[PDB]
Amino acid sequence: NEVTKERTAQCFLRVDDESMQRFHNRVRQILMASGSTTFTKIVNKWNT
């Protein structure tokens, strides 16, 4: 609380289902798009 400088609330953070599903779909489309891609290309996409 900026006016009083005291811990008055508590914000619990979480990743929503939409973001988890989007990341899972991204990994899926990385994996399925691996007909001839090198291992390095796949892992670079994974790290990114």
Partner: protein, 141 residues
């Protein structure tokens, strides 16, 4: 399926293998009424004109021609065999069997890929060629 030329007796398929020297003979052994055989007998339709230069496709019903079942192991529902200058061109897939494609696929580019690879390896004079794609899985995920 029905559009591609058909072979009726044992002599005709041997002649079709022998009556060509500068292309590859891709024979689809099986039953054209099979759901599996009809899945890829339309892929072979969609590329018959494209591969005219280096491939000719004949269809054979093993019931109509019960002469190659025992020798070439015609007991899977659908089989594809490649012949070059009267020589069965072995092809190394991801699957254990390296003499045939005993499953019907879906993409019209990969079959031309395999046929052109077979032709390329047969002009050199090999007996076993290596497919580009690996079929030890289905890449599904």
């Amino acid at each position: 399926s029905y559009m591609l030329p058909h072979l009726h007796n044992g002599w005709q398929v041997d002649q079709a293998i022998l009556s060509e020297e500068d292309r590859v003979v891709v024979i689809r052994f099986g039953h054209d009424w099979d759901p599996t055989c009809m899945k890829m007998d339309e892929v072979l339709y969609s590329i018959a004109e494209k591969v005219k230069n280096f491939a000719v496709i004949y269809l054979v019903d093993i019931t109509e021609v019960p002469d190659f079942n025992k020798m070439y192991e015609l007991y899977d529902p659908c089989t594809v065999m490649f012949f070059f200058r009267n020589k069965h061109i072995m092809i190394d897939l991801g699957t254990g069997n390296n003499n045939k494609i005993n499953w019907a696929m879906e993409d019209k580019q990969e079959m031309v890929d395999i046929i052109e690879t077979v032709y390329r390896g047969a002009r050199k004079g090999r007996g076993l060629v290596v497919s580009p794609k690996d079929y030890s899985t289905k890449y599904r995920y």
